């Protein structure tokens, strides 16, 4: 067990990392379905590499590799949607955003590094259940943390791993750099709490609306950084139909799995969205969600960067298909 892990590092820290072109990770329309585990890790390395993070922060191939692997093994396999392939698909979206969407040219190297590390670990040790549930079931994690419970935990984990020996991919940073990187990373991961996205997006939607929004502003920026996290965290909804189709199948199951617990240990009725029996009201529930949470946001993101439009396009394109379905 420890053995398969350790050879995994041997084989990984010695394979050639293919180009970004080869890996089609520059694409908003990208899919992981056909990649192996080892391949995904490789992409990740290519990500760090092509963002100049590797060179500008004196990362040793050895270390990065260990770290990456560590994150991989700290996502739960038994968990339907919120496994490693989610953290990975998010980071790739994030990567695609900075490159093809052209945002890199809009922010610092400290920020880029933080976003990537955050994107990768924003859901660590997610146990396939929402903040709402853990709160209502008096999980000890709820006793520990106040608000954004899970997201606080995801970070507690991220940080535990970065402090692990031979995982200090940050070891190269000045203490001041390190110190503020971590700050941003904390902000990023917490931002993936849907509740904060909601309690904050209004502000941001207006600066856009009023043609006032401007990156230069320190605060305006860090808000946007939150919004960007959300944007990638659920980028799945902006995928080609056949993909969106299938990934919506996982979210489906994971929800329904929680729904079961709600009436088996909690003895409450689950929301329809997690009510396994109501599987036939999926598509409208999808529609309402896309309307409520998504289009709104990806629109904004394009006003900020035009080259980010494919996200908006793919989003409404799926909304189209769910709506049809909802009408059988």
């Amino acid at each position: 067990s420890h053995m398969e892990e350790t050879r995994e590092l041997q084989s990984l820290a010695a394979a050639v990392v293919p180009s970004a072109q080869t890996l089609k990770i520059t694409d908003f329309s990208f899919s992981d379905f056909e990649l192996s585990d080892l391949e995904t890790a490789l992409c990740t390395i290519r990500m760090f590499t092509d963002l100049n993070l590797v060179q500008n922060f004196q990362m040793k191939h050895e270390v990065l590799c260990r770290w990456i692997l560590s994150v991989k093994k700290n996502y739960r396999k038994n968990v339907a949607y919120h496994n490693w392939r989610h953290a990975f698909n998010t980071a790739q979206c994030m990567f695609a955003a900075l490159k093809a969407g052209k945002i890199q040219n809009k922010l610092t190297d400290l920020e880029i590094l933080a976003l990537l590390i955050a994107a990768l670990s924003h859901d660590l040790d997610h146990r396939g259940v929402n903040n709402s549930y853990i709160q209502r079931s008096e999980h000890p994690l709820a006793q520990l943390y106040c608000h954004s419970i899970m997201e606080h935990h995801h970070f507690d984990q991220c940080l535990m791993i970065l402090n692990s020996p031979g995982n200090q991919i940050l070891s190269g940073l000045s203490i001041e750099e390190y110190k503020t990187t971590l700050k941003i990373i904390k902000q990023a991961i917490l931002a993936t709490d849907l509740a904060l996205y909601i309690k904050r997006r209004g502000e941001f939607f207006e600066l856009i609306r009023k043609n006032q929004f401007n990156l230069e502003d320190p605060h305006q920026k860090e808000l946007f950084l939150a919004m960007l996290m959300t944007a990638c965290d659920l980028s799945a909804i902006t995928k080609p139909w056949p993909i969106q189709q299938r990934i919506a199948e996982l979210v489906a199951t994971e929800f329904w799995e929680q729904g079961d617990l709600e009436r088996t240990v909690l003895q409450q009725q689950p929301i329809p969205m997690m009510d396994r029996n109501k599987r036939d009201e999926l598509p409208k529930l999808q529609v309402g969600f896309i309307d409520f949470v998504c289009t709104q946001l990806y629109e904004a993101l394009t006003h900020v960067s035009e080259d980010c439009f494919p996200l908006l396009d793919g989003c409404r394109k799926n909304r189209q298909k769910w709506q049809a379905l909802a009408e059988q």
Partner: antibody
Amino acid sequence: EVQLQQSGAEVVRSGASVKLSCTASGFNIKDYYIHWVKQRPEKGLEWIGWIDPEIGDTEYVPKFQGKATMTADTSSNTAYLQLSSLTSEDTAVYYCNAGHDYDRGRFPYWGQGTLVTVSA
Amino acid sequence: DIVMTQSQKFMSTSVGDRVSITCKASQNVGTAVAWYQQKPGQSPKLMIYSASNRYTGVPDRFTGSGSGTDFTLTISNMQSEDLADYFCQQYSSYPLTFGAGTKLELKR
């Protein structure tokens, strides 16, 4: 081993009601859907519907709406089938069976069946 | 409702024979079919599922094949204990439906 044990045969009067039981041993019904299927003399099996003993949710096929009522109880591991306003046509062997709730429809466990004979 | 047709109500066989039982679906059910064995007054038992997979514990002499609308349960080297009723079932979609059964009988 995993077993579904059904109650004995009943001879009932037309217009009355009868309640059949199906008890699980060697396993727990909670994570299964319990289905009931009818078999008339010289005829093939016909599905009646299922119950999710975990939440109590049931689904009946239209021919049995108001005819059959399924209930379950996970602590005693027993599922029940109530048949009301019985007629000659309800005479048949009734089976309860079980399959994983996340499973499309394989029936790995079946009770031995209960013969119900209705007559006035 | 999808009709599962088992054209043969009875089939005479002998210990040692290779026997095949057919089941036809009225609609495309993919490989979403299962076969059950039943003896008088006893619980049916799962034998084959997904059209060709043997359920745990069932002897290797039972196999199944087919897809779409034509399915077949095959018993290689039939044994005395194999004399029983067999029926297919589709679980492609609701309502779940069954064939009317085929009874294996002894030849003399």
